[PDB]
Amino acid sequence: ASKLRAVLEKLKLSRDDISTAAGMVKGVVDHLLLRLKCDSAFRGVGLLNTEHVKISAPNEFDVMFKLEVPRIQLEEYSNTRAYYFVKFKRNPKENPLSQFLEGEILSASKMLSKFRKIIKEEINDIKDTDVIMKRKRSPAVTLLISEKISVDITLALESKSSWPASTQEGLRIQNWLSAKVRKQLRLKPFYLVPKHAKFQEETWRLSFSHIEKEILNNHGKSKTCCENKEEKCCRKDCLKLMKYLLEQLKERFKDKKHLDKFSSYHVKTAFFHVCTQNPQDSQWDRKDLGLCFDNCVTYFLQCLRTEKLENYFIPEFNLFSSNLIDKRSKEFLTKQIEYERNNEFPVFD
Numbered sequence: 005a006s007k008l009r010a011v012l013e014k015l016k017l018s019r020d021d022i023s024t025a026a027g028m029v030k031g032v033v034d035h036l037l038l039r040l041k042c043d044s045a046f047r048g049v050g051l052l053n054t055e056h057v058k059i060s061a062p063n064e065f066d067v068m069f070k071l072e073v074p075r076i077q078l079e080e081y082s083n084t085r086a087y088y089f090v091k092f093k094r095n096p097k098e099n100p101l102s103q104f105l106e107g108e109i110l111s112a113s114k115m116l117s118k119f120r121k122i123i124k125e126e127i128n129d130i131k132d133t134d135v136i137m138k139r140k141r142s143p144a145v146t147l148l149i150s151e152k153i154s155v156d157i158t159l160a161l162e163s164k165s166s167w168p169a170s171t172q173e174g175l176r177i178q179n180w181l182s183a184k185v186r187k188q189l190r191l192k193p194f195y196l197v198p199k200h201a202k203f204q205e206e207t208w209r210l211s212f213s214h215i216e217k218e219i220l221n222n223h224g225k226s227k228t229c230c231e232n233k234e235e236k237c238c239r240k241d242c243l244k245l246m247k248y249l250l251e252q253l254k255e256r257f258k259d260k261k262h263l264d265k266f267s268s269y270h271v272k273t274a275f276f277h278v279c280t281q282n283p284q285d286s287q288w289d290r291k292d293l294g295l296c297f298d299n300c301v302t303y304f305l306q307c308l309r310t311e312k313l314e315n316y317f318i319p320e321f322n323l324f325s326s327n328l329i330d331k332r333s334k335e336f337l338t339k340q341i342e343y344e345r346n347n348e349f350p351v352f353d
């Protein structure tokens with residue numbers, strides 16, 4: 005309760021502390037977009053959220069470029085619910101992405117190659133800052149700025165049509181944020197990013213990287229949640245502590261492999277499931293931070309032990325299935341978390 009608050013305070017002070025890092029990243033990114041926009045395949049390219057995956061690493065940034073693709077035809081791959089072939093409707097007004105077609109199918113490989121190549125050409129043009137490009141270890145392109153700051157650049161396709169049918173029963177926020185809000189969010193665009201399941205096929209994965217911010221900024225059942233003193237909730241703090249718990253555990257055991265397949269979006273997913281289960285703001289009273297954090301831990305442990313964690317958008321996709329993460333890894337993380345809970349969370353210090 006008091007220990008958790010102190011953890012949150014030290015995290016806050018490093019975030020809010022004076023840093024030239026964001027200015028250096030923006031300068032590099034703005035150069036790239038100008039270079040990409042001159043190219044025929046990428047003239048519509050722009051920034052998605054005009055981010056930090058690790059709270060413990062303030063020099064590591066995550067950036068997403070988006071490209072609008074109108075009249076897109078999506079074909080689900082092998083019933084995976086999340087992976088799709090990208091085809092183009094027969095509306096030929098010269099498609100800018102034709103050079104990436106392999107048949108009727110849009111090739112992620114060929115598109116990333118030319119994105120990669122154009123970026124590489126603008127890197128070796130900038131003289132002010134030293135920018136170093138790493139070699140395709142997806143997640144698309146990783147840059148190194150002044151040997152301290154690192155940026156992962158992801159290329160996403162953007163569609164403004166209705167979300168695919170696999171999402172129909174997801175985003176189960178009706179009893180928490182309202183049916184009206186669920187409708188508003190589902191009018192936003194959706195995104196597609198490269199990579200396949202399990203030979204390599206040219207499939208894209210659905211991406212909803214823009215939804216979390218929308219929820220977190222308007223997260224209460226009450227419209228006035230966290231706008232006054234009588235309605236302060238701990239939802240954002242609990243999510244931060246879950247993300248930091250996993251980070252610290254991945255760092256403690258980084259020389260082993262048992263935690264390599266877990267990442268923040270697993271924690272995000274399980275957190276927002278607890279928000280669905282506990283929709284009222286009184287279930288998230290600031291005074292109950294330690295107890296609320298415990299709900300979240302307990303639910304995440306239940307997910308590990310049962311090997312069931314539904315994607316928040318595509319509920320039939322089990323993030324914790326045997327084919328994606330094996331029993332041994334889930335059993336290892338369970339033991340570490342259970343040890344943390346029973347020892348007043350050592351990792352935080």
Ligand SMILES: Cn1ccc(-c2ccc(Cl)c(CNc3nc4[nH]c(Cc5ccccc5)cc(=O)n4n3)c2)n1
Binds near residue numbers: 276321
């Ligand atoms: C990064 N990765 C690697 C593989 C996948 C992935 C796997 C299966 C599916 Cl079925 C999908 C479907 N798409 C998808 N699912 C999420 N879940 C959240 C987390 C979240 C939860 C609740 C509210 C807000 C955010 C973030 C995000 O961007 N997405 N995108 C994505 N993702």
Ligand SMILES: [Zn+2]
Binds near residue numbers: 223224229235238239
């Ligand atoms: Zn609140």
